[PDB]
Design brief:
The protein is mainly beta and 114 residues long. The chain has helices at residues 57-60, 81-88; strands spanning 15-22, 34-40, 43-50, 68-71, 92-99. 11% of the residues lie in helices and 31% in strands. The PDB classes it as immune system, signaling protein.
C-alpha cells in the first residue's frame, strides 16, 4: 500500500474473491454470521466473528476469522454499526475477502456441470 510495508513481494501475490450471498426470505431465513470491528493504528478493519454452519456464508466460503475489505462497494472503515446493521438486514449481500493461491484449481462447485 502506502506509508508502510509493501505486503508480500512475490511473483504470485494473494488473490481476492467476490462472495455474494442470497437468501430466500428475510422474514425468517436470516444470515447467521456476525461482523466484528478491529481498530489498529487508526485503520478500522472488519473481521468475521462467527458463521452459521447450516447457512449460506459458511457453505459459500466464509469462516470465523475472515477479513472484510469492502461491502457492496463500500469501505468498511466508512461503514459504522448503523450501516452494518442495514447491510445485515438485506436479502442479498456482497462481501470482498482476500485469499492465497494454490495448486487446487480444476473443478468448481455448483450446478454448472456438463
Amino acid at each position: 500500500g502506502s506509508s508502510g510495508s509493501s505486503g508480500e513481494i512475490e511473483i504470485c501475490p494473494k488473490v481476492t474473491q467476490s462472495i455474494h450471498i442470497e437468501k430466500s426470505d428475510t422474514a425468517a431465513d436470516t444470515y447467521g454470521f456476525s461482523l466484528s470491528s478491529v481498530e489498529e493504528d487508526g485503520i478500522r478493519r472488519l473481521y468475521v466473528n462467527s458463521v452459521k454452519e447450516t447457512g449460506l456464508a459458511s457453505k459459500k466460503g466464509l469462516k470465523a476469522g475472515d477479513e472484510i475489505l469492502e461491502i457492496n462497494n463500500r469501505a468498511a472503515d466508512a461503514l459504522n454499526s448503523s450501516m452494518l446493521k442495514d447491510f445485515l438486514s438485506q436479502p442479498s449481500l456482497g462481501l470482498l475477502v482476500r485469499t492465497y493461491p494454490e495448486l487446487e484449481e480444476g473443478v468448481e462447485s455448483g450446478p454448472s456441470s456438463g
